[PDB]
Every structure is written in C-alpha cells, then in structure tokens.
Amino acid sequence: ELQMTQSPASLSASVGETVTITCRASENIYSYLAWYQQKQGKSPQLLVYNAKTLAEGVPSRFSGSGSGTQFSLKINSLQPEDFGSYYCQHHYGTPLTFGAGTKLELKRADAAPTVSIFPPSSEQLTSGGASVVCFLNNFYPKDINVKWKIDGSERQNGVLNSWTDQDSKDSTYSMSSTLTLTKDEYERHNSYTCEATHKTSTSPIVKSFNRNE
C-alpha cells in the first residue's frame, strides 16, 4: 500500500517562531495531501486539503505546499494554540494512509523538578500493601531518570512511572513514580529514597524519609 513519511517525529519551538514539518509519499499523489491537527486528549481537526487549501476557520499563518511525493506544512509565527500533534494523510483514492505524526511541543528554559515524597498511608498498610510515592513536578526538558533506593540498595521491581503531557500554562512536564511493596517488606527497612537525575544538575535531586520517624 501507499506509505507516508513525516519529519521530524518531534520538534520543539517557541511561540512566534516559524517552523516547517514534512511528509513524504512513497508514490506520487499529486496535490491530494491533507493535514490534521490533534490536541492532547481531543479529536483530530482538518487543517489543510489539496496540499495547500486551508479548511474553513483555519488561520492564515498556516501554509501547506508541495506536490507529487514531497510536502511541507509551514506555520508562521506559532501561537499557543498551535502546539500538539500533526498528521498528514493523502486523499488520492483508497486505502487512505496517515503519516506517523509530528509532535510539536513548546520550548522553554530548563527547569529542575519540585520533588515530593510520600510514605505508604496507614490506610493502605492495613490492607497488606505499601506504596511509596514520589512526584517530580514541573520540570524541563521531559527527559528524566528516577531511582528508588531502600537502605541504600536500588529497587527495580514494583516501580510504576507515569508522565503528564506538557503543561499548557508553563510548558513543563511532571512525573509520578510509585514504588509498591508488601507491608511486611516495607516494615523490614527504614530509609526510602526517591532519586532524580535531570539535565538541570550534576547532583541528583533526592527526597528521603525514614519509616521509624
């Protein structure tokens, strides 16, 4: 079947900046190329069709071009509402196929996480379980490493990590890491540490707490 290729997979840009993303058709499709915008947690919206025709309501700062097998979508002076994902899709007969998408994120200055650690709740301890939680909030860039240490030894089992999508108010990312243990194993150790290593420092950020305290 016909295959579309989008580039780049991800791009960071500032509001007011001008960028261009591309899409390549494995076979000639003339100018029958559409672009869709999809906001985090929203349904896609049509932005362009016939490679250069803007759908109704789409601002003029959006500009598509190309024909044949190589296409580009240019966004002049990006606005807050422009960040999110972009998919190209040819509409030259069936089957329709989509590019893998370009995720366009906001660029901001580097920022260290605000780290908070929480011991298992007495409630949970009564059920036989013990989850230790660590929030690594509002940091940038998105890349970060978290490690759990119990009495000094790193614990790799039972760790659940989850990242939020970029905050639309301050362009940061947040992450939650939960170390889950059984209550009796939890009672066999005293020191629990959430350790984060981020670009913003050579010294990892550390939050700890002692069971007996």
Partner DNA sequence: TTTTT
Compute the least distance from the CB of residue 138 to DNA, in Å: 41
User: Which amino acid is residue 195, in one-letter code?
Assistant: E
Residue 210: C-alpha distances to residues 119, 127, 150, 173 (Å) = 9, 21, 10, 28
Residue 89 interacting partner from other proteins, DNA, none (CB closer than 5 to 8 Å by kind): other proteins
Q: Identify the residue among 62, 92, 98, 118 touching DNA (CB under 7 A).
A: 92
Structure tokens at 45: 């919206």
- Cβ contact 147:195 at 8 Å: yes
Distance CA(192)–CA(150), nearest Å, equals 5
Structure tokens at 133: 């939680």
Is the Cβ of residue 47 or residue 104 nearer to DNA in the bound state? 47
Q: Identify the residue among 56, 123, 184, 213 touching DNA (CB under 7 A).
A: 56
Residue window 11-50: x/- pattern of binding to DNA, with contact defined by CB under 7 A = ---------------------x-x--------------xx
- Longest CA–CA span in the chain (Å) reads 71
| Site membership for DNA, residue 188 (CB under 7 A) | no
Q: Which residues pair with residue 175 across a beta bridge?
A: 136, 163
Restricted to residues 58-87, the positions that interact with DNA (CB under 7 A) are none
Is the Cβ of residue 127 or residue 156 nearer to other proteins in the bound state? 127
Structure tokens at 169: 């108010």
- Cβ contact 13:78 at 8 Å: yes
Compute the least distance from the CB of residue 148 to other proteins, in Å: 15
User: Would you give the distance in Å from CA 167 to the centre of its chain?
Assistant: 10
Distance CA(39)–CA(45), nearest Å, equals 9
Cis peptide before 59 (omega within 30 of 0): no
Compute the least distance from the CB of residue 77 to other proteins, in Å: 25
Is the Cβ of residue 32 or residue 141 nearer to other proteins in the bound state? 32
| Site membership for DNA, residue 95 (CB under 7 A) | no
Q: Identify the residue among 41, 93, 95, 128 touching DNA (CB under 7 A).
A: 93
Is the Cβ of residue 63 or residue 97 nearer to other proteins in the bound state? 97
Tell me which residues touch DNA (CB under 7 A): 32, 34, 49-50, 53, 56, 91-93
